[PDB]
From a paper:
The enzyme uridine diphosphate (UDP)-glucose pyrophosphorylase (UGP, EC 2.7.7.9) occupies a key position in UDP-sugar metabolism as it converts glucose-1-phosphate (Glc-1-P) and uridine triphosphate (UTP) to inorganic pyrophosphate (PPi) and UDP-glucose (UDP-Glc); the latter, in turn, can be converted into UDP-glucuronic acid, UDP-galactose, and UDP-galacturonic acid. In the search for new treatment options, P. aeruginosa uridine diphosphate-glucose pyrophosphorylase (PaUGP) has been proposed as a novel drug target because it is required for the biosynthesis of important virulence factors and linked to pathogenicity in animal models. To establish a basis for the development of selective PaUGP inhibitors, we solved the product-bound crystal structure of tetrameric PaUGP and conducted a comprehensive structure-function analysis, identifying key residues at two different molecular interfaces that are essential for tetramer integrity and catalytic activity and demonstrating that tetramerization is pivotal for PaUGP function. Importantly, we show that part of the PaUGP oligomerization interface is uniquely conserved across bacterial UGPs but does not exist in the human enzyme, therefore representing an allosteric site that may be targeted to selectively inhibit bacterial UGPs.
The crystals have the symmetry of monoclinic space group P1211 and diffracted to 2.9 Å resolution. The crystal structure comprises residues 1–279 of PaUGP, of which we were able to successfully model residues 1–275; the C-terminal residues were not modeled due to weak electron density. Each PaUGP subunit contains one UDP-Glc molecule and one Mg2+ ion in the active site. The crystals of PaUGP contain eight molecules per asymmetric unit; however, through analysis of crystal contacts, it was possible to reassemble the biologically active homotetramer as seen in HpUGP. Each PaUGP subunit contains an open twisted central β-sheet surrounded by α-helices on both sides with a total of 12 α-helices and 12 β-strands, resembling the Rossman-fold characteristic for nucleotide-binding enzymes. Using symmetry-related objects, we reconstructed the biologically active PaUGP homotetramer as seen in HpUGP, which can be described as a dimer of dimers, with subunits A/B as well as C/D forming “tight” dimers, and A/C as well as B/D forming “loose” dimers, respectively. Subunits A and B, as an example of the tight dimer, are packed with a burial of 2,005 Å2 of solvent-accessible surface. As in HpUGP, subunits A and C, as an example of the loose dimer, are less densely packed with a total buried accessible surface of 1,054 Å2; however, a tight hydrogen bond (H-bond) network is established between four charged amino acids.
Residue numbers in the entry:
A (entry chain H): 2 to 275
B (entry chain F), D (entry chain A): 1 to 275
C (entry chain B): -5 to 78, 80 to 275
The structure:
Amino acid sequence: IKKCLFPAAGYGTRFLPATKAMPKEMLPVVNKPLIQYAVEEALEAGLSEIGIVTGRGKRSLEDHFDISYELEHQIRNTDKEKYLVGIRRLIDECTFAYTRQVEMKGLGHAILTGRPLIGDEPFAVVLADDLCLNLEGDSVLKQMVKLYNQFRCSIVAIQEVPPEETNKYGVIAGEMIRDDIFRVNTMVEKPKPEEAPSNLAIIGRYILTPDIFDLIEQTEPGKGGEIQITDALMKQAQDGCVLAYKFKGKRFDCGSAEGYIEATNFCYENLYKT
Amino acid sequence: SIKKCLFPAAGYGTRFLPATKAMPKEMLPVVNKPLIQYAVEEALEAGLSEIGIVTGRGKRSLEDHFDISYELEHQIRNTDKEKYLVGIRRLIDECTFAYTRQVEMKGLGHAILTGRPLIGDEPFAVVLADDLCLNLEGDSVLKQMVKLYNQFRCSIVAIQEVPPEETNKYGVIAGEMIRDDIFRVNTMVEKPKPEEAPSNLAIIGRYILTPDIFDLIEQTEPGKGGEIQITDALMKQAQDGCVLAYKFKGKRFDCGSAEGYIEATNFCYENLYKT
Amino acid sequence: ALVPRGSIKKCLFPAAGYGTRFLPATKAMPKEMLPVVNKPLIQYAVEEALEAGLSEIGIVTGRGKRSLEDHFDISYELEHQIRNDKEKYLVGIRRLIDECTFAYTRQVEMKGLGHAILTGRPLIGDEPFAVVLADDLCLNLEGDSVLKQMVKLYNQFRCSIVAIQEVPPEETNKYGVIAGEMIRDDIFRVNTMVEKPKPEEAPSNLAIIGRYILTPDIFDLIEQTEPGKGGEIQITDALMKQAQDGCVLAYKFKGKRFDCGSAEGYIEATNFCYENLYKT
Amino acid sequence: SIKKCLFPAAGYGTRFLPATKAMPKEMLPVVNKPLIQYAVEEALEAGLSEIGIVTGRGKRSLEDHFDISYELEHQIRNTDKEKYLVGIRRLIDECTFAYTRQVEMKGLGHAILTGRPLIGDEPFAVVLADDLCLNLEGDSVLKQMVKLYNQFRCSIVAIQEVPPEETNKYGVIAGEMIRDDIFRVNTMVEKPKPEEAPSNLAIIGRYILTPDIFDLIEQTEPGKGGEIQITDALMKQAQDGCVLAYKFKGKRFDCGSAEGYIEATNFCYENLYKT
Ligand SMILES: O=c1ccn([C@@H]2O[C@H](COP(=O)(O)OP(=O)(O)O[C@H]3O[C@H](CO)[C@@H](O)[C@H](O)[C@H]3O)[C@@H](O)[C@H]2O)c(=O)[nH]1
Ligand SMILES: O=c1ccn([C@@H]2O[C@H](COP(=O)(O)OP(=O)(O)O[C@H]3O[C@H](CO)[C@@H](O)[C@H](O)[C@H]3O)[C@@H](O)[C@H]2O)c(=O)[nH]1
Ligand SMILES: O=c1ccn([C@@H]2O[C@H](COP(=O)(O)OP(=O)(O)O[C@H]3O[C@H](CO)[C@@H](O)[C@H](O)[C@H]3O)[C@@H](O)[C@H]2O)c(=O)[nH]1
Ligand SMILES: O=c1ccn([C@@H]2O[C@H](COP(=O)(O)OP(=O)(O)O[C@H]3O[C@H](CO)[C@@H](O)[C@H](O)[C@H]3O)[C@@H](O)[C@H]2O)c(=O)[nH]1
Ligand SMILES: [Mg+2]
Ligand SMILES: [Mg+2]
Ligand SMILES: [Mg+2]
Ligand SMILES: [Mg+2]
């Protein structure tokens, strides 16, 4: 597995007007765009062929991941060995392919939109609005890539949440295979806490097998009138293998205002000042 | 009446890379509002509806944010979430935006001289958006300074009392006191070693300038760091013209620095976005 | 109530038109960027302004506003791909970037050429200024550029100047037409101006070509102008007001003009510049 | 079967400076339609709806041309949404465009290898948009070649008979003749000296390639002008595989040269614009 897909064509509503001309995934956490954390995360797991589904402010994605000749000459007097090491590696070690999602019909349609970039290969999906950090060990995506070579199924990252906060996520339920691994049998997107079948909510880290594409084409609109992955993975869990995995590490919900501030404050004390 | 405001936004922003690789430091958002948007709403509150932006590395993010977005109108179509956009929309309908490039980074003074085609022979305000200035209790810092200009009709410089140890990070002025908050600038030095700054009154990024400053910038030689400093050009004006330093009403976060940027983020989330 | 008639230093370029005649190509590019063989229409125009001594260029941008900006800004990528010398081609554009200052402002809604010129008011101020419509490709290889001729005439008589040329009476509905007293063979004092009149109602056969010298009171006159032909605000109608209680001169310029706002003139200009300029 | 088409558009295009400064040579307009739009309509006509563009110096104008324009729609309200827009809306309606950047201009072969993430392990067509090919009497050149591929399932290269004096401008092929217009290639040379030109038959910018060409390009050393030539890579394929040359039916204009660009403009003006 060497491919990673990044959906970045949402409405990004909780951060207007800042997200007017840049996607929610480009917001900087102190000094690093959300999506740059995620791309560095995928390279750690060996996924060096990056594919980005773009929408409004698509141009902020591209310009960030180009060889900037303006920036190149402005910083002639180095000190890029102090600030650009991370972004430069990405440009020299990764390939970036971009494709446009014309109409916002949900995450599932966004994942289906990137099919020509993936083909008949297993691929990872990273939702950058979920900032995942594991400074102690390997990042969440590497945890899931190592898990794929062993089980060779779809893997979805999850973590327990409060039951009142359950209608904000997709939630899975199933029998346990290991200390932190589950056989999924049911998946619902943003259910009513009364109908919440579990307290095990997905973060947006997914490892998908190419047969998911033909399943998304069979998925009908669900929560919010959008085509949810969650429903496409559900169909895959019945006739196939889909594992839920409680990752090791810290996650911030940077799709929310509150979570973004937590991430900004966290990364300043533990990442910037150092 | 003073009606133009200039925004230098062609800095290196070396402290906020890589995020500033393709967007200027002045476009960083506190919670969900770019720094420069606060400043333009500040300028419009003072009656300055003719905005001119001097652009540099990430020129497209400045233009794209203050441009009408026909895509945005289609995605948030039919009233929908205008609750997040009223501020920016008002700017687009009531303000005019003009852009000009600074291709060589030679200092804040040179950047202001670069905006001369956008200004001409009339007084204008200069705003450094990396200084987030807020006055919840009343008029904005720029509105305060515009009212002072209509009165004295000379160049006005925003200042604030600063600890003596941090005097090497700002421009410092000194002069005789005309009022508890207004000083007639005698002396101006950029970033002074702390037992050489003539006072502990530091310049904040808000100016009102008279057109004669342009020809004074052309006579200014490179100073601190080899850059052309508006502080040095403003010194020449003090000698045989009027320059007033004003201790403004309000709070200023140093969002040009990483620590001040977070102070502003946390403050605005608790008092403004959560509201 | 005092009109400044001082030295001219600024030139304004309206480039926010819909450009429907070349619509596929202009989807993301202004009609004024269509290359005549290898040089964009507007580059010809800005070189015209530099020859006249006007190094302060303001561009009113629209749909493909980004094609304009990228062509006149310092492209660091372009310099990297050479810096070793195929700058025979880049002599003209590098000159413009080194000797001119460019400022841009957007026209939000298309209400006409007059509204477009008013849109550039923040770039101009209370100054006399020239206006160039880049879809009118003007060449004078045996002498001065059209705008250079017009600047010389302004410096002497200090009025608003409108470049004109005689055209057949049947094509009069494509242009604005003037009529007035003839001071000398190539100079007229304008009395009346109508935009795209029907051939029966045309004041003369003297058609306005996109080269203007304007005094800054035209701005206040554009704001008083009511929508005209097609519901747009025409500069012709504001200049009509100025011609009444002021001085507006029509100038029969020397040189060849191509109508590159029409497909036919675009093809004609392409072949002319290819044979007489490109293999040279 | 085959559904993908690749468009290299990251050349230097210096013959068209300064017009190409911020736009690729493949975006130049022929009277009113960009050169690369003709080519994509050609690819759609052949059933190739998955478009991949390898971009470079003017990569922005490309993206913009094939992306949805909310501004252009708002500016029209169902009016001239026929006119010249008919062709380009169908393209955005029926195709999927993916873009990847060519960081280093090392040749046409390197440009095709750069697009490997967009193609994968499946056959694809390559189109050089500077070759304007028009066949008003039937199928498009690419359509002809896709039909030929469905039978032989080799790599197919479009060729054209040219005078021996022009062989240093093209890649030239030589091989045993299968039919009056189909040849089994065993030799391929890029821009040979007319004296050593192996034949009269010159390569036009239309290809059908099998995915093993990718690994062939990585093994290819710098050729003509020190650049990586697909001609040299296709040579390797012809020796250890099957490569067919096809005298296509239709008229081709060399819009990579100024003279041929004028020819295309005049031709398309008389025969297509009025129509
Ligand atoms: O049409 C669309 C909609 C969304 N996105 C992107 O998809 C991601 C997630 O979209 P978002 O609006 O944040 O959805 P959520 O409310 O977060 O829900 C999703 O993300 C959760 C984890 O963050 C999962 O638990 C849920 O199952 C999943 O539905 C973001 O990158 C969006 O930009 C697109 O690219 N296209
Ligand atoms: O060539 C340049 C350099 C800077 N800038 C911009 O202008 C401002 C410069 O500020 P900065 O680079 O942070 O310098 P400072 O340390 O801010 O110093 C200036 O701003 C302080 C207010 O914050 C004052 O105290 C000082 O007198 C004054 O020199 C920023 O918005 C830059 O983006 C330009 O546009 N062009
Ligand atoms: O709302 C608008 C309309 C036009 N333009 C620009 O201004 C010029 C207008 O040209 P065009 O649309 O071709 O107008 P014309 O029909 O050619 O008419 C103008 O040009 C003729 C000379 O070329 C004159 O005779 C007319 O009086 C004058 O109105 C072009 O550069 C446009 O891009 C704008 O910027 N904004
Ligand atoms: O590093 C590069 C070089 C070129 N190109 C593109 O490749 C195409 C062809 O480049 P060009 O320089 O025009 O090549 P030619 O000299 O025309 O030669 C090519 O096209 C000829 C016919 O047009 C063939 O006969 C040759 O074999 C083939 O190499 C154009 O789209 C270029 O932009 C790239 O994308 N990257
Ligand atoms: Mg989310
Ligand atoms: Mg500062
Ligand atoms: Mg015209
Ligand atoms: Mg070629």
